[PDB]
Amino acid sequence: KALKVRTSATFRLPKTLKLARAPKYASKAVPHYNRLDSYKVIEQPITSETAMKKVEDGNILVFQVSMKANKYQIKKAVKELYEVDVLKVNTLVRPNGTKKAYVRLTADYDALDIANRIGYI
Amino acid sequence: AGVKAYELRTKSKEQLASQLVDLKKELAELKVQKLSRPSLPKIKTVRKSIACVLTVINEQQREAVRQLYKGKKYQPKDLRAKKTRALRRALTKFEASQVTEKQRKKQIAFPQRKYAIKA
Amino acid sequence: AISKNLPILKNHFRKHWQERVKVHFDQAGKKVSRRNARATRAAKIAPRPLDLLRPVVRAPTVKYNRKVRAGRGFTLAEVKAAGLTAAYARTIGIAVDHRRQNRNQEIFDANVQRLKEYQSKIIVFPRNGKAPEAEQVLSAAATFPIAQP
Amino acid sequence: AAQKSFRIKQKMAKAKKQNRPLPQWIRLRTNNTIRYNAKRRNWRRTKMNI
Amino acid sequence: PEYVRVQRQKKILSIRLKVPPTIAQFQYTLDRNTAAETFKLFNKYRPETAAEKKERLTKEAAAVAEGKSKQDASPKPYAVKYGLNHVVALIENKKAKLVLIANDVDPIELVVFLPALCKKMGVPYAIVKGKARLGTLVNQKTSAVAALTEVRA
Amino acid sequence: GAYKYLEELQRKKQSDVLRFLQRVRVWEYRQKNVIHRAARPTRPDKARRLGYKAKQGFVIYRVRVRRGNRKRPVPKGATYGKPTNQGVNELKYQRSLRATAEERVGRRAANLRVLNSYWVNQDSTYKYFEVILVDPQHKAIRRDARYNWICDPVHKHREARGLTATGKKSRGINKGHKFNNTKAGRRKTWKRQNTLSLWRYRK
RNA sequence: UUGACCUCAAAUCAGGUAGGAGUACCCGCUGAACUUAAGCAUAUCAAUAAGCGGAGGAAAAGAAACCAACCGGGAUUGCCUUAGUAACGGCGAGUGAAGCGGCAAAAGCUCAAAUUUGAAAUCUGGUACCUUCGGUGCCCGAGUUGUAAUUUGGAGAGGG
RNA sequence: GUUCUUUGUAAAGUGCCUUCGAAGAGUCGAGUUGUUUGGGAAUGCAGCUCUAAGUGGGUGGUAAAUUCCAUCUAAAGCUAA
RNA sequence: GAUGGGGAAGCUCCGUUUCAAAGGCCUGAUUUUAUGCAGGCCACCAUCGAAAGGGAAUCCGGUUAAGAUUCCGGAACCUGG
Ligand SMILES: [Mg+2]
Numbered sequence A: 001k002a003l004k005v006r007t008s009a010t011f012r013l014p015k016t017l018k019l020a021r022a023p024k025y026a027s028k029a030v031p032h033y034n035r036l037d038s039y040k041v042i043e044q045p046i047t048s049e050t051a052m053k054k055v056e057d058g059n060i061l062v063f064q065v066s067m068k069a070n071k072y073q074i075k076k077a078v079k080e081l082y083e084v085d086v087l088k089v090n091t092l093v094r095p096n097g098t099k100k101a102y103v104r105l106t107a108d109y110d111a112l113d114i115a116n117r118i119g120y121i
Numbered sequence B: 001a002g003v004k005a006y007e008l009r010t011k012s013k014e015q016l017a018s019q020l021v022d023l024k025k026e027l028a029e030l031k032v033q034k035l036s037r038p039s040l041p042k043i044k045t046v047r048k049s050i051a052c053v054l055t056v057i058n059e060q061q062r063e064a065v066r067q068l069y070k071g072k073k074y075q076p077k078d079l080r081a082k083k084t085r086a087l088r089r090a091l092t093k094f095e096a097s098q099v100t101e102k103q104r105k106k107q108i109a110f111p112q113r114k115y116a117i118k119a
Numbered sequence C: 001a002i003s004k005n006l007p008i009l010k011n012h013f014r015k016h017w018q019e020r021v022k023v024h025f026d027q028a029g030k031k032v033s034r035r036n037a038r039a040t041r042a043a044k045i046a047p048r049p050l051d052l053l054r055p056v057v058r059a060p061t062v063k064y065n066r067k068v069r070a071g072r073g074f075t076l077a078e079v080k081a082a083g084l085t086a087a088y089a090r091t092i093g094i095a096v097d098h099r100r101q102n103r104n105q106e107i108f109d110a111n112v113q114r115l116k117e118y119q120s121k122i123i124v125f126p127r128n129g130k131a132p133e134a135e136q137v138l139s140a141a142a143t144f145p146i147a148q149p
Numbered sequence D: 001a002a003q004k005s006f007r008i009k010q011k012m013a014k015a016k017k018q019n020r021p022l023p024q025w026i027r028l029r030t031n032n033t034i035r036y037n038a039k040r041r042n043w044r045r046t047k048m049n050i
Numbered sequence E: 001p002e003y004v005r006v007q008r009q010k011k012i013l014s015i016r017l018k019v020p021p022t023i024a025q026f027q028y029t030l031d032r033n034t035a036a037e038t039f040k041l042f043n044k045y046r047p048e049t050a051a052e053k054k055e056r057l058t059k060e061a062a063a064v065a066e067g068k069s070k071q072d073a074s075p076k077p078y079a080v081k082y083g084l085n086h087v088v089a090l091i092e093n094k095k096a097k098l099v100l101i102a103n104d105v106d107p108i109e110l111v112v113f114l115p116a117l118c119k120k121m122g123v124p125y126a127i128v129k130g131k132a133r134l135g136t137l138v139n140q141k142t143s144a145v146a147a148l149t150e151v152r153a
Numbered sequence F: 001g002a003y004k005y006l007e008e009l010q011r012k013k014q015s016d017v018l019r020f021l022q023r024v025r026v027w028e029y030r031q032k033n034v035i036h037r038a039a040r041p042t043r044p045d046k047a048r049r050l051g052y053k054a055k056q057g058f059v060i061y062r063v064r065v066r067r068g069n070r071k072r073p074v075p076k077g078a079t080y081g082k083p084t085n086q087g088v089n090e091l092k093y094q095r096s097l098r099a100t101a102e103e104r105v106g107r108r109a110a111n112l113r114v115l116n117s118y119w120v121n122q123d124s125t126y127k128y129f130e131v132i133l134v135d136p137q138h139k140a141i142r143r144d145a146r147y148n149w150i151c152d153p154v155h156k157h158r159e160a161r162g163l164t165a166t167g168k169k170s171r172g173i174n175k176g177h178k179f180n181n182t183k184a185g186r187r188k189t190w191k192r193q194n195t196l197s198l199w200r201y202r203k
Numbered sequence G: 001u002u003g004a005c006c007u008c009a010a011a012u013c014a015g016g017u018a019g020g021a022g023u024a025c026c027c028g029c030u031g032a033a034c035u036u037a038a039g040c041a042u043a044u045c046a047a048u049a050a051g052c053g054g055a056g057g058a059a060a061a062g063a064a065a066c067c068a069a070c071c072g073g074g075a076u077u078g079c080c081u082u083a084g085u086a087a088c089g090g091c092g093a094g095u096g097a098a099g100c101g102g103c104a105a106a107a108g109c110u111c112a113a114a115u116u117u118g119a120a121a122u123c124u125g126g127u128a129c130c131u132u133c134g135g136u137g138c139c140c141g142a143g144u145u146g147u148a149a150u151u152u153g154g155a156g157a158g159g160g
Numbered sequence H: 001g002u003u004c005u006u007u008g009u010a011a012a013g014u015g016c017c018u019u020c021g022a023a024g025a026g027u028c029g030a031g032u033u034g035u036u037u038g039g040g041a042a043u044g045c046a047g048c049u050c051u052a053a054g055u056g057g058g059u060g061g062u063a064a065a066u067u068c069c070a071u072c073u074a075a076a077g078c079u080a081a
Numbered sequence I: 001g002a003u004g005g006g007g008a009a010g011c012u013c014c015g016u017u018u019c020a021a022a023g024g025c026c027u028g029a030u031u032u033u034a035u036g037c038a039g040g041c042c043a044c045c046a047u048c049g050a051a052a053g054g055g056a057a058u059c060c061g062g063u064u065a066a067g068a069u070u071c072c073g074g075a076a077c078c079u080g081g
Helices: A049-057 A071-082 A111-118 B013-034 B043-068 B085-089 B101-109 C027-044 C076-082 C086-092 C105-121 D006-018 E002-016 E032-042 E050-066 E084-092 E113-121 E131-137 F003-010 F016-030 F044-050 F097-108 F165-171 F186-194
Strands: A042-045 A060-065 A086-093 A099-105 B115-117 C021-023 C056-058 C068-070 C122-124 E098-102 E125-128 E145-148 F035-038 F058-066 F113-122 F126-134 F196-198
Touching (some): A042 B013, A060 A071, A071 A086, A071 A099, B013 B043, C076 C086, C076 C105, C105 C122, E002 F016, E032 E125, E032 E131, E084 E113, E084 E145, E098 E113, E098 E131, E113 E125, E131 E145, F016 F058, F016 F113, F016 F126, F035 F097, F044 F113, F044 F126, F097 F113
Antiparallel strands (some): A042 A060, A086 A099, B115 C122, E098 E145, F035 F058, F113 F126
16 A cells, blocks of 8 residues: 655654543542632731821721732722722731731722721721 | 530521621621720630531531432542551452452361360 | 680670670560460460370480470371371361371371370360360370370 | 842741740749740840841 | 664564574465465354353253253354464364464464474464454454364364 | 473573574664563563463563673772772672662552563673563452462562562572571571570579 | 554543651661771671661561481471580681570461363453442453463372 | 351262373573682672583582482462461 | 653762654634634743843822832823733
């Protein structure tokens, strides 16, 4: 019989059908709940005098935030927990090892009105 | 005080989830009061109640998965037994009691007799 | 070094001999545990006499061939002359040695006679039923002593 | 340094939290043998070596 | 790739070297016409498959249930014999009538003694192409030998 | 029975048929890797005499090792000691090439158990062995009471502890007056006859 | 053209397994020198320390290619003894077992090499059901380049 | 000890006659080299070279030739105290 | 400095594109549709290595006890969609 024509001197590995996994049993069998939800990303507010100066002057809430949370999670959870639209989030890591978040709210909401609704003033 | 596990066990999973989120709301409301008050020992009861609710939810889900995988080989590894790595790798009782048919014929023909010696 | 009129000593203590010193402090406790092991073995084999029957046999060298002693097991020729198979003898408690031979008729006759007395003295239970309990003795060697001819 | 890594800042935070005297109610407990913070560290006297 | 290169250069080397006559006692295989008609003869005597064996045993069990024949309701089989130790014992017992040896056994030392043994014991042998052909004759993958020991009239 | 024909043919290694076959196969084995899987035993009679059975869970690898002495691995031949220990070149390894071959095969397949090994070929540079291995997790070896003893954990790395046939040969484990140094273990006997035994009532 | 076989691959293919720790005791490899010889090189320290590989509750060894030379013994291990002996050794310093005897504990065994050839009788896996350390049915596959039964030299096999 | 299944037209053992009786190879062994041992014209181990037999082979502690005798059965494997 | 390989009794050593069957890229085609099958293109061949080398893009004014090209007010720019 005739052989297959090859226009290249290189021989490559042929393409093989690669199946997907169909396991007989589940890996962990109970999916974990939300590791980092809204109640875990927001621990407590900071109520020092420097922070309390910001809540009428800058319209900025100050929260202590878990170290695993980023600005998207902070913004989403502030919107979910307090039903407030936020303008921006600026975070830092304090020298004691915790994380502090300055959340500046939109102009429609008043952080002074929201702080004593939460329960601190 | 707190919640009791035996009375938590009679509820469904949605009621347990709702009780969990009200417990978390209460924990946040106590944490915002801890900074103003000197001492607040009521936080520990809410924390242990949250732990109790999570334990009951996890045990309900795990028992449901056990009954889903009931009566078949290849159940998940965290559901099957733990004991030790060596005891899991050891031969089962059937494989250890496997004997050749030649030895079985010899054992049936000549077993160890029971005998006594005085008369 | 060498000194007054004394014998020449050979004390082999030039290695780290203090690393290998075995002092048998556990002689008494080892004896107690050994008796415990004998008693629990006897309770485990509760009718059987704790040791097999050994043949009488002639000691090897010219220093010791004047004496007779106990062997490992009976010859297949001896158990065939006694009138029972080797497998059955091993199950009823007779030590069988497949690798010793009979070249001495007196030793052969003594071992055949010893097997005859053992078969007269034992009681073999049925494999299934009543088990007529029979108050074990603990030493077939003591019930069949080795006698110098 | 000003440009530091997070591992170094984490260890610095832990040592800052450890830098405190003894809580004064510890001495009032029964069978208390603790008199003072024996593991106290100052930046002038000994270095962290991290 | 190297497996292609090894499997080509190996059969290159096996004819570059002067082979000693016990090898190249092979490679004069049977011609294709006589090979076709001897496989046509051997195809009539094929060992029983698993399903027809199973219904044969059900018929035998029913027959010993009804009439208690000593497993002799079924007639005498007529099948090709296969398996190397089996056919060597048949050749040594002079029971084989015709022996076919595959030409491509990959330890060749499994079958180099077979033509000399067949010549000494007087059994007619043929070196034939295809251990796969012998295997599909005896319902295996590879058979490496075949033998007719007793044929119908 | 073809196996005794295969044996007594295999003893004629300088017959022309075997040296031609050896000459082809040694090239074929140089062209492959140092350790590679053999599909079937080259000598099935030798494999089944050493204990192989053609069932699922019996594995054959092929292996080549470098021949010759063991050069003492010291920089520039300096030994830093007494002149009795200044030898570098003519020193010999105490284990066999078969032993180090099956030990490398066991390290390659640590999930298997080494049963035996046999010589297949050699040249000036390499010696060629085939190693029989048995899978102690396969159910055909978990069952089949003739072979489930290999699943006991005391048989992990028998070739590394010297418990195979060539391992016991190299350790000297044999009955007799020629093996008084090495009969129950050389270091065990050395400790036994270098121990000082003192009783409670001193003898 | 189509369908096999052999060999070699690829898959986040189905299910498994190895690594590391500990390391007193155990099985091996590798391997010194200080020291002693009133110096020192063979020797000794020492077939040791350090280094490397590999196990278990013990490990290893173990049912003779044994010991013997007798009226013979009879797997292995350990203790008492043989014995600071036979022997080795700049025959210097030094080193140095084993047989028998008494005792503790005692236990024996199985593959390869045989034609089932009037029926591969054998086995993994998947699936369904069940009483689930597994069983039954069915289906692929492994396997004749040999899986079961039969025998292990003390024997044993085929006939009568 | 008490009870249920009958395993199983299965398996095993024993006596006499007859024909047999398969038993492991780059191994055993030999030379040489190194190491080791109480082992001494070479105790074991290992490298290289040579390389068997089948009334054969090994051992029998002084090398070698010749004639005997004794005792085991290697080069595959499991196993409590 | 892994892998493929080759040494080493071994801890590990060599080598970094090598005696390797070493991969991904866009258009789409199909609209049981998922992403295989229509196609076609390409052969580097891990990765780590600069807070002074290369490099997308922000300035001014004000503000604190202690922060700012980062906050506030104003005015811009870049990247991805
Ligand atoms: Mg070398």
